[PDB]
Design a protein around this ligand. Structure first.
Ligand SMILES: CC(C)[C@H](C)[C@@H](O)[C@H](O)[C@@H](C)[C@H]1CC[C@H]2[C@@H]3COC(=O)[C@H]4C[C@H](O)[C@H](O)C[C@]4(C)[C@H]3CC[C@]12C
Ligand SMILES: *[C@@H]1O[C@H](CO)[C@@H](O[C@@H]2O[C@H](CO)[C@@H](O)[C@H](O)[C@H]2NC(C)=O)[C@H](O)[C@H]1NC(C)=O
Ligand SMILES: *[C@@H]1O[C@H](CO)[C@@H](O[C@@H]2O[C@H](CO)[C@@H](O)[C@H](O)[C@H]2NC(C)=O)[C@H](O)[C@H]1NC(C)=O
Ligand SMILES: CC(=O)N[C@@H]1[C@@H](O)[C@H](O)[C@@H](CO)O[C@H]1O
Ligand SMILES: *[C@@H]1O[C@H](CO)[C@@H](O)[C@H](O)[C@H]1NC(C)=O
Lengths: 175, 733
């Protein structure tokens, strides 16, 4: 399926020194059997939890291909690179945890497309840019902890951000 | 002068203790690995001596030997990367393989300074080809080059190797890399051997050109398809053709038969009936693999003419009709017959008792065969049969004890049949027997104690039978027992406190039985044990601390390679217990798994994990799986339960286990599934349990548990149901 293709592309962009992605099998019908990857009763990916794999590498565009993905935890790795805007093409979603990484560049405005998104931690990275005013859009977000990476540009109160303590900002070069 | 080069080498060994007979007084010729011709040193062979040194060491010292003809360092743990060096025109052969060599592959060009060198084997190392493909290897005085199973990724890298021209190259092997795109050996007119196996070629099907000299073609294990017949038509000179594990479709094409000995078209999209024209290839043809394709009909009778064919494997095709004994007796060449995964039908020919004398391995598994197993099968005094795979068939009635009369039998797999009545006690006499698999049959009674006179018995798989009574104690005489799967029986009694004596026991699965009484602490004595599935049982007691004692010193590499399934517990059915079922599947078919339905309540609406067993560690690992669910097992879960780095799944569910979750439960890093659910556990869920960063599943439900859910970490991703029924619990997340 296209999904296994996607996650494969990730197993390539990534570097797997602790061989967590070893079980990801590219000949397989679906990647439903892979380790740490999981699926629904319909055999589409709902999760990928590689979180804290000591895994290093870049994220990748094909990652947008996992339309039923909900919780994605790439968190607490040595992952470098930018956050691909087709991450927004993952329409279903709950949690996005890129936290505690070396990911570089802008926090993509395309996250304004994930209405179901209930969690965002872009926390603890090194990111460069505005925040979008398009993340004011979403309104679910019972938590956003993006801290520890340099942004500024403002601290929005378009207000969907109404519900957040600043404990959520911590050093953003903010306002 | 020379001698002093040899001690100059000796210095760098860390690790001076190797090469002890190398000493300054003595004449170099008396040295280990040192070979002289008329008292001058033509070759050093250090193979399988842990040199643990740099390549540039070796070359500074040895490669400069005036006159040295060859060097063999294979598996020396030679380190580093291959540089330019002064080298003598007499060194013609270098075996650097089974090593650590690193860099770009372009390093190898430097060897152009070795002017006589016709032989290089660097295989089984780390070389990569990182940027982009051009320049050349520019080693053209080479007759033989083996770059295989290195880290090489690219395209027309095959073009790169042959780039400065190949003319004198007889043998080329690039297998087990990622190389891709185009192969042209067409210029190489001495080329007898081309091995491109296990690569990325999806496109060019090699251009051999004249193919005048080529006897060996291995293009197996690629995404390769396209017209290969037309490609290889130029040879007729060829001894081996391996086109397996590829994308080839269509009817078996005309291919050259004159010297053909081994032919595998296996594992492809090939359809149709095994062609007559194949024919005269019987002059030699010492082995044939048509397995894993789309072929149908029955074994064409001309196959009686290859009395030179040692092994015919037709497995996994549409082949039907009854067992072609008429042909099968005619080939007195035959050693292994693989008929597995087909539509062969009928009862088991009496007329077949002969094979049982000639044959090493009879694989009839996954077909339609019925009636009983010939009691008369093993009646020959002659009988050699090592491997009998009758598993997954329709065989009715008792296991013939007369079967003991096959005295060479190592593997007996009768499983997934309808066999009734008891297990032959008889079987105790099979003195070379290792794997015995009886699981999913109607066998009853007891597990025959005589099985103790088997000193090689490794596997024992009894699952989904009626076998009653305790564990036969005499099994404590089986030193080589590793995988004991007794699950889904009426078995009574305890775990033998001797079970800790089997140094080799790896997978022990006691599920769905009545086994009772305490969990033996001697369980902590077994160096090999990685999978303990005790679920759905009557066990008494408290988890002992000694139970883990061995964790961290563990080596499980013996159990490795055995094929299986895991059926993961849906949980969606009330009745179904455990985390999941680890079943032996070798040669049992995937789609007949529902034949389980009536014995196991669980959904096969489930996701079935599976493949060949591979422990994630070599040495110094831990217990990989523990399910103690559904018992009267109770008390304090010890701190020691944290001592398992490599443990994947922990299911302690539905017990009277009481007290509180030790902080150390955070140190099961490799823990993906944690189920403590449906217990008497109380108190608070330690936030140090945030440390399980790989967890895709938690169930803490049905306890006296109190306090808040520790949000930082994987915990927030888990639906609140899985915390339900802890009245004193502070959280929803
Ligand atoms: C070493 C042997 C004992 C064993 C057969 C082994 O080779 C086998 O391949 C093991 C490691 C696999 C096979 C079945 C696997 C489990 C199948 O059950 C599941 O719940 C999956 C889902 C999820 O992706 C988890 O991260 C892994 C997890 C929980 C797997 C964890 C690892 C296994 C237990
Ligand atoms: C290259 O060397 C490797 C390792 O030294 C050789 O591989 C072993 O060769 C023996 C004899 O063929 C086989 O029984 C094994 O299957 C091989 N082991 C490996 C690495 O798979 C290989 O034969 C050498 N090739 C040449 C051309 O000398
Ligand atoms: C034909 O090619 C196939 C695939 O390249 C060979 O298969 C492998 O054999 C080794 C044993 O040395 C195994 O460890 C691999 O797992 C095998 N792969 C397969 C297909 O399962 C096959 O042996 C080749 N045939 C010959 C005899 O040369
Ligand atoms: C004695 C026994 O347990 N037999 C049942 C069988 O009736 C049923 O078909 C199956 C389905 O879950 O469960 C088992
Ligand atoms: C154990 O065996 C009986 C016999 O069918 C079966 O019905 C029951 O469901 C099994 N228990 C489990 C948990 O599978």
């Amino acid at each position: 399926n296209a999904e296994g293709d996607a996650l494969s592309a990730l197993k390539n962009s990534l570097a797997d020194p602790n061989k967590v992605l070893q079980s990801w099998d590219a000949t397989l019908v679906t990647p439903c059997t892979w380790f740490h990857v999981t699926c629904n009763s319909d055999n589409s990916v709902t999760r990928v939890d590689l979180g804290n794999a000591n895994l290093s590498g870049q994220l990748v565009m094909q990652l947008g291909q996992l339309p039923n993905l909900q919780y994605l935890e790439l968190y607490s790795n040595n992952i470098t690179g930018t956050i691909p805007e087709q991450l927004g093409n993952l329409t279903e979603l709950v949690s996005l945890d890129l936290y505690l990484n070396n990911l570089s560049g802008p926090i993509p405005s395309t996250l304004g497309r994930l209405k179901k998104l209930r969690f965002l931690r872009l926390n603890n990275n090194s990111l460069s840019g505005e925040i979008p005013r398009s993340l004011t859009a979403v309104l679910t977000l019972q938590v956003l902890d993006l801290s520890n990476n340099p942004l500024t540009g403002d601290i929005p109160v378009n207000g969907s951000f109404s519900l957040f303590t600043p404990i959520s900002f911590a050093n953003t070069k903010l306002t | 002068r020379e001698i002093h080069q040899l001690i100059s080498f000796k210095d760098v060994l860390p690790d001076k203790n190797l090469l002890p007979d190398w000493s300054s007084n003595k004449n170099p010729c008396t040295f280990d690995g040192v070979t002289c011709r008329d008292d001058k040193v033509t070759s050093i062979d250090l193979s399988s001596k842990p040199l643990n040194v740099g390549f540039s060491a070796v070359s500074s010292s040895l490669l400069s030997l005036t006159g040295l003809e060859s060097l063999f360092l294979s598996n020396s743990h030679i380190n580093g990367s291959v540089s330019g060096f002064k080298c003598s025109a007499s060194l013609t052969s270098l075996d650097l393989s089974r090593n650590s060599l690193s860099g770009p592959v372009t390093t190898l060009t430097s060897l152009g300074s070795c002017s006589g060198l016709k032989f290089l084997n660097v295989s089984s190392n780390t070389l990569d080809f990182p940027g982009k493909v051009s320049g050349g290897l520019k080693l053209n005085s080479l007759e033989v080059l083996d770059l295989s199973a290195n880290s090489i990724s690219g395209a027309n890298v095959v073009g790169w190797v042959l780039s400065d021209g190949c003319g004198e190259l007889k043998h080329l092997a690039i297998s087990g890399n990622k190389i891709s795109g185009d192969v042209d050996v067409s210029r190489c007119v001495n080329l007898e051997f081309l091995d491109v196996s296990s690569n990325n070629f999806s496109t060019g099907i090699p251009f051999l050109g004249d193919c005048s000299a080529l006897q060996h073609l291995d293009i197996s294990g690629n995404k390769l398809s396209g017209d290969f017949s037309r490609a290889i038509s130029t040879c007729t000179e060829l001894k081996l053709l391996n086109i397996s594990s590829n994308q080839f479709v269509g009817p078996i094409p005309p291919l050259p038969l004159k010297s053909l000995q081994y032919l595998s078209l296996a594992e492809n999209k090939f359809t149709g009936e095994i062609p007559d024209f194949l024919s005269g290839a019987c002059d030699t043809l010492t082995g044939l693999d048509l397995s894993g394709n789309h072929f149908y009909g029955a074994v064409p009778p001309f196959f009686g003419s290859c009395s030179l064919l040692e092994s015919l494997a037709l497995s996994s095709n549409n082949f039907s009709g009854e067992l072609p004994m008429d042909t099968l007796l005619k080939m007195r060449g035959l050693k292994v017959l693989d008929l597995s995964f087909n539509e062969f039908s009928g009862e088991l020919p009496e007329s077949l008792t002969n094979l049982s004398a000639s044959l090493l391995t009879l694989d009839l598994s996954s077909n339609n065969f019925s009636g009983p197993i010939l009691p008369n099968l093993c009646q020959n005094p002659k009988n050699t049969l090592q491997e009998l795979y009758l598993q997954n068939n329709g065989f009715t009635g008792k296991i013939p004890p007369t079967l003991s009369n096959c005295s060479e039998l190592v593997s007996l797999h009768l499983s997934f049949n309808y066999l009734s009545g008891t297990i032959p006690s008889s079987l105790g006499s099979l003195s070379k027997l290792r794997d015995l698999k009886l699981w999913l049959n109607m066998l009853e009674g007891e597990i025959p104690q005589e099985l103790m006179y088997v000193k090689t018995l490794e596997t024992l798989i009894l699952d989904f039978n009626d076998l009653t009574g305790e564990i036969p104690s005499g099994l404590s005489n089986c030193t080589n027992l590793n995988w004991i799967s007794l699950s889904n029986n009426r078995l009574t009694g305890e775990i033998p406190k001797w079970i800790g004596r089997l140094e080799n026991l790896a997978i022990l699965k006691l599920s769905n039985n009545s086994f009772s009484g305490n969990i033996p602490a001697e369980l902590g004595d077994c160096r090999s044990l990685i999978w303990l599935d005790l679920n759905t049982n009557l066990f008494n007691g408290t988890i002992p601390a000694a139970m883990f004692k061995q964790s961290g010193k563990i080596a499980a590499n013996f159990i490795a390679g055995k094929r299986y399934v895991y059926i993961k517990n849906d949980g969606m059915k009330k009745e179904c217990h455990g985390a999941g079922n680890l079943l032996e599947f070798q040669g049992i078919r995937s789609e007949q798994l529902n034949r389980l339905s009536t014995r196991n309540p669980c959904n096969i609406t489930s996701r079935v994990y599976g493949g060949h067993t591979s422990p994630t560690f070599d040495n110094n690992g831990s217990m990989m799986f523990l399910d103690m669910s559904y018992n009267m097992l109770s008390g304090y879960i010890p701190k020691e339960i944290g001592s398992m780095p490599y443990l994947f799944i922990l299911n302690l569910g539905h017990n009277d286990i009481s007290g509180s979750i030790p902080d150390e439960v955070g140190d099961l890093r490799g823990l993906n599934i944690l189920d403590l659910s449906s217990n008497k556990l109380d108190g608070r869920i330690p936030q140090a349990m945030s440390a399980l960063t790989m967890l895709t599943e938690i169930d803490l439900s049905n306890n006296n548990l109190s306090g808040p859910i520790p949000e930082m970490g994987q915990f927030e991703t888990f639906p609140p149901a899985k915390f339900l029924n802890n009245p004193g619990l502070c959280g929803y997340p």
